[PDB]
Structure 1
Amino acid sequence: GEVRRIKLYAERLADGQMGYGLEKGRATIPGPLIELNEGDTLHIEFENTMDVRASLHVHGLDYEVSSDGTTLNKSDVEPGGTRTYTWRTHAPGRRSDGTWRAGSAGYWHYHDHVVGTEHGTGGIRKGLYGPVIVRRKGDVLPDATHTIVFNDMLINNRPAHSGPNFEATVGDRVEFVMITHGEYYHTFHMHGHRWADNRTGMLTGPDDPSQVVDNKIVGPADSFGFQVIAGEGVGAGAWMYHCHVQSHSDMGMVGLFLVKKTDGTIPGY
Structure 2
Amino acid sequence: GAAPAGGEVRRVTMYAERLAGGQMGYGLEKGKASIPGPLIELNEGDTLHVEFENTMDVPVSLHVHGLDYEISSDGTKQNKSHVEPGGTRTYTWRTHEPGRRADGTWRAGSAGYWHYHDHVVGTEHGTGGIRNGLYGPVIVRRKGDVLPDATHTIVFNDATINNRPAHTGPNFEATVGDRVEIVMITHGEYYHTFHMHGHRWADNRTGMLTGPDDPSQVIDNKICGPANSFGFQIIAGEGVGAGAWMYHCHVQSHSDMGMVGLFLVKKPDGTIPGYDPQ
Same fold (TM > 0.5) = yes
Deviation at 1:22, TM superposition (A): 0.4
Deviation at 1:242, TM superposition (A): 0.3
Encode CA deviations 1:55-79: one digit per residue, 9 max, x unaligned.
1000000000000000111100010
Deviation at 1:265, TM superposition (A): 1.2
Q: Distance in 2 between matches of 1:164 and 1:14?
A: 18
Q: Distance in 2 between matches of 1:183 and 1:26?
A: 28
Q: Distance in 2 between matches of 1:109 and 1:216?
A: 18
Encode CA deviations 1:32-54: one digit per residue, 9 max, x unaligned.
00000000000000000000000
Encode CA deviations 1:108-167: one digit per residue, 9 max, x unaligned.
000000000000000000100000000000100000000000000000001110000000
Deviation at 1:18, TM superposition (A): 0.3
Q: Distance in 1 between matches of 2:102 and 2:121?
A: 42
Q: Distance in 1 between matches of 2:203 and 2:95?
A: 23
TM-score of the two chains, using structure 2 as the length reference? 0.96
The corresponding residue for 1:167 is: 173
Q: Distance in 1 between matches of 2:177 and 2:85?
A: 47
Please tell me the root mean square deviation across aligned C-alpha atoms, in Å.
0.4
Question: Which consecutive residues of structure 2, in runs of 5 or more, have no partner in the other structure?
Answer: 1-6
Q: Distance in 2 between matches of 1:90 and 1:152?
A: 32
Matched, 1:198 2:194: no
Question: Which consecutive residues of structure 1, in runs of 5 or more, have no partner in the other structure?
Answer: none
Deviation at 1:177, TM superposition (A): 0.2
Deviation at 1:16, TM superposition (A): 1.2
Deviation at 1:190, TM superposition (A): 0.1
Size of the aligned set, in residue pairs, is: 269
DSSP-derived class of the 2:79 partner:
coil
Q: Distance in 1 between matches of 2:195 and 2:238?
A: 17
Q: Distance in 1 between matches of 2:196 and 2:27?
A: 29
DSSP-derived class of the 1:36 partner:
strand
Identity within the alignment, %: 91
The corresponding residue for 2:223 is: 217
Q: Distance in 1 between matches of 2:43 and 2:259?
A: 33
Deviation at 1:15, TM superposition (A): 1.6
DSSP-derived class of the 1:27 partner:
coil
DSSP-derived class of the 2:147 partner:
coil
TM-score of the two chains, using structure 1 as the length reference? 1.00
Q: Distance in 2 between matches of 1:105 and 1:14?
A: 35
Q: Distance in 1 between matches of 2:88 and 2:97?
A: 30
The corresponding residue for 1:108 is: 114
